[PDB]
Amino acid sequence: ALGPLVTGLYDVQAFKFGDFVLKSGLSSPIYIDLRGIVSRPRLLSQVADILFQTAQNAGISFDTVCGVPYTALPLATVICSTNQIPMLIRRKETKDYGTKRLVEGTINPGETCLIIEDVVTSGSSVLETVEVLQKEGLKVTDAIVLLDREQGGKDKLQAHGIRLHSVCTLSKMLEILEQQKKVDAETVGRVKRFIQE
Amino acid sequence: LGPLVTGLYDVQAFKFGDFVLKSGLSSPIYIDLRGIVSRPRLLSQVADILFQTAQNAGISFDTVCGVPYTALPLATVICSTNQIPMLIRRKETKDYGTKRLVEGTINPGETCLIIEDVVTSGSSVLETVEVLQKEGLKVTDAIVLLDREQGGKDKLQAHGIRLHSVCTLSKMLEILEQQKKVDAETVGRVKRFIQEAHH
Ligand SMILES: O=C(O)c1cc(=O)[nH]c(=O)n1[C@@H]1O[C@H](COP(=O)(O)O)[C@@H](O)[C@H]1O
Ligand SMILES: O=C(O)c1cc(=O)[nH]c(=O)n1[C@@H]1O[C@H](COP(=O)(O)O)[C@@H](O)[C@H]1O
Ligand SMILES: [Cl-]
């Protein structure tokens, strides 16, 4: 069902082309922004559903769910509300200022927390949230992400005991967009070539 | 309403002791809904009651926005359940490299409904209203689960915003007494505190 999902994303302007610098400091000709999904109720639901379905298809076990701040937060909420799962919230809005504790919700050490994320590049953002949760005594083995950019994330997460499960890779997303005439072939070629370097 | 209060009790939402509120006054009671994320059924019920309050008021709006932070998931559930477009206010500490203040599709002149967990002075609601107004949205109404009855309705009215409350602190204390979760002493103590706090 990726074709409709990707089009849906394109139509909330999820795909930005231009010259960007990523969290990891990499230049990129493309930037994928899922903040707009909250403007299209059905699309937000579709994204929540496919994320959850990805976790279920993998056959994994978890007691609770945490979104990586900020864009993934509503996705976690919809998943948890629809499927009746307790949720944890990592509060990042005051960063490391003062001494208030960073994680909201019921933390029962030994329980497994599933991570929900929007886009993974290097993997560092997921891992930062993973470490925070592990330091509270929670077990964390799996992360589900909507878009894997395929820039080292799976391998970096696996090096820390985390299995990355993605709905779609960047290359598959670019292929759908070209097939659907949303982006031209030269842009896809340029974007792929650039990323490779 | 009773069942909703019981759920809130279970997620330890009612704290007693001595607390300084954001408005700088001391209080014998604090209502902390942060634990509601651990009970998705209760979260949904809270979300539904807030939305029904708006619907029974016959107000109209184009989008919905929660006051940071506890209410963010309540707005998300209202919007998800009822298929309403959402805005998210992103409140941080004005550090270097902050991003836009409101996420989602902003159509200037459209009307945004504000959703809140607890109102005391009304200042927290008003801050969010002003951010949305600056971004070009019309705001006329706020729905709050618990109105602590410390001048919120008036403060908000003074800035053109009508506060609708699901429940007041007075009422919630009565329900809590009925359910034998709080004694006839601390009920009086908190009651006395409410008239005191209006000064
Ligand atoms: O900055 C990125 O690398 C990034 C690329 C992109 O296409 N979309 C995007 O949202 N990002 C943001 O950067 C974070 C991922 O970068 P890593 O921490 O390197 O995986 C994600 O959580 C995104 O929020
Ligand atoms: O500090 C409060 O007033 C307050 C009291 C309370 O019982 N529960 C509670 O959550 N608050 C928080 O304080 C703010 C409400 O205070 P005002 O900004 O004065 O209306 C909101 O951010 C509330 O979430
Ligand atoms: Cl949320």
Q: Decide if B85 and A41 are in contact by the 8 Å CB cutoff.
A: yes
Beta bridge partners of B88: B103
Within 10 Å of residue A197's Cβ, how many Cβ atoms? 5
How far apart CA A62 and CA A64 sit, in angstroms, is 6
B173, B185, B58, B67: which is closest to B122 by C-alpha? B67
Q: Decide if A106 and B35 are in contact by the 8 Å CB cutoff.
A: yes
A45, closest residue in chain B (CA to CA): B80
The correct answer on CATH 3.40.50.1360 for the domain covering A1-197 is no
Q: Decide if B80 and A45 are in contact by the 8 Å CB cutoff.
A: yes
| DSSP code of residue B138 | B
Q: What is the largest CA-CA distance in chain A?
A: 51
Token pair, residue A3, equals 């074709």
How far apart CA A93 and CA A91 sit, in angstroms, is 6
CB under 6 Å to ligand 2: residues?
A: B 21-23, 30-31, 70, 117-124, 152
Strand B141-147 with B112-119, pairing: parallel
Q: Which helix (H) or strand (E) holds B194?
A: helix B184-197
Q: Decide if A97 and B93 are in contact by the 8 Å CB cutoff.
A: yes
How far apart CA A88 and CA A67 sit, in angstroms, is 8
Domain boundaries, chain A: 1-197
Distance in angstroms between the alpha carbons of the first and the last residue of chain B: 29
Yes or no: say if B113 and B124 are a contact pair by the CB < 8 Å rule: no
A95, A60, A88, A96: which is closest to A72 by C-alpha? A88
Interface mutation target, options A43, A63, A77, chain B, most CBs of B under 10 Å: A77
Residues 6+ apart with CB under 8 A from A172: A2
CA dist A70 → A56, A60, B89 (Å):
24, 24, 11
Nearest-neighbour CA in chain B from A144: distance (Å) = 20
Which of B68-73's residues contact partners 24+ apart within 8 Å by CB, and which partners?
B68/A93, B68/B128, B69/A91, B69/A93, B70/B33, B70/B34, B70/B36, B70/B117, B70/B118, B71/B115, B71/B116, B71/B117, B72/A73, B72/A74, B73/A73, B73/A74, B73/A77, B73/A81, B73/A87, B73/A89, B73/B36, B73/B37, B73/B43
Q: In angstroms, what is the resolution?
A: 1.9
Token pair, residue A92, equals 């990042």
State the count of interchain CB pairs (< 8 A) between A and B: 90
CATH of B1-199 given 3.40.50.1000, 3.40.50.300, 3.90.1150.10, 3.40.50.2020: 3.40.50.2020
Kindly report the protein residue whose alpha carbon is nearest to atom 1 of ligand 2: B21
Q: Decide if B103 and A35 are in contact by the 8 Å CB cutoff.
A: yes
Question: Is B34 within 8 Å of chain A by CB?
Answer: yes
Beta bridge partners of B16: B29
| DSSP code of residue A20 | E
Which method, experimentally, gave rise to this model? X-ray
Total residues belonging to chain B: 199
Token pair, residue B130, equals 């002003």
Q: Which residue in B35, B40, B87 is closest to A84 by CB distance?
A: B40
Integer Rg of chain A from CA: 17
How far apart CA B28 and CA B19 sit, in angstroms, is 6
- Probe residue for ligand 2, chosen from B118, B126, B129, B172 as the CB with the greatest number of ligand atoms within 8 Å: B118
**Cα A72 versus chain centre, distance:** 6
CA of B71 to the centre of ligand 2 (A): 12
How far apart CA A52 and CA A191 sit, in angstroms, is 29
